[PDB]
């Protein structure tokens, strides 16, 4: 749909949509920019991630409200409407996964880009897993695990322990362990090991990088406080 707009105009409009909190528009603009076929800059990757995280975040919150209402009920209307939102959520997840597969991941050679996209792939398989109930749930769960695991292997070899992408990846992989894989001890071990090695590396950072790293480090601490 965005094939006739300039790449630079799509990027500029994605930023305007963020300012207007029009995240659906922002996602459509960034999808158009990805489909131009060029690799994304660091800033452009963030725009892509922010756009779809907000879109799917609203769908997930709506799905949870309706699934709760549905659970207390057990007419077809609640199930029907929960299924409608669920299908729209899965469509957005498939769209993001399609962008990563065609062809963001295969062209991502640098550690910062490849880890970023593999983290995204794990995240959107995680969101698919939250609503899955059929014969494909285990395969969906393993697709999330495999994507997270490759990202972790690269991040451990190529990034410092305080790198915000490495920290955010570990945070979300620990949430995957706790919420999806029924492995709360793995979730707790990953979050604490990640936090402690970040602690020990903060002395190398500037004041601005220190602020970036400690902010995500606090999210790990919040989860450990909730889980222990």
């Amino acid at each position: 749909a965005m094939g006739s707009m300039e790449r630079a105009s799509l990027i500029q409009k994605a930023k305007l949509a963020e300012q207007a909190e029009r995240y659906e528009d922002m996602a459509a603009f960034m999808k158009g920019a990805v489909e131009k076929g060029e690799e994304l800059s660091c800033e452009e990757r963030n725009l892509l991630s922010v756009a779809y995280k907000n879109v799917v975040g609203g769908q997930r919150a709506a799905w949870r409200v309706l699934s709760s209402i549905e659970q207390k009920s057990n007419g077809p209307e609640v199930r029907e409407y929960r299924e409608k939102v669920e299908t729209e959520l899965q469509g957005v997840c498939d769209t993001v996964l399609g962008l990563l597969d065609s062809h963001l991941i295969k062209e991502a050679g640098d550690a910062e880009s490849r880890v970023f996209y593999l983290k995204m792939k794990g995240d959107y398989y995680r969101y698919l897993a939250e609503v899955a109930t059929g014969d494909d749930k285990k395969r969906i769960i393993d697709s999330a695990r495999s994507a997270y695991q490759e990202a972790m292997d690269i991040s451990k070899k190529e990034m410092p322990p305080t790198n915000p992408i490495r920290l955010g990846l570990a945070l979300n992989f620990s949430v995957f362990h706790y919420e999806i894989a029924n492995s709360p001890e793995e979730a707790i071990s990953l979050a604490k090991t990640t936090f402690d090695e970040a602690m020990a590396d903060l002395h190398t950072l500037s004041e601005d990088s220190y602020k970036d790293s400690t902010l995500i480090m606090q999210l790990l601490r919040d989860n450990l406080t909730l889980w222990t």
């Binding site: 995280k53 945070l171 949430v175 706790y178 919040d222 989860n223």
Partner: peptide, 7 residues
């Protein structure tokens, strides 16, 4: 629910 990464 625990916290995942959020900008």
């Amino acid at each position: 629910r625990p916290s995942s990464w959020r900008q």
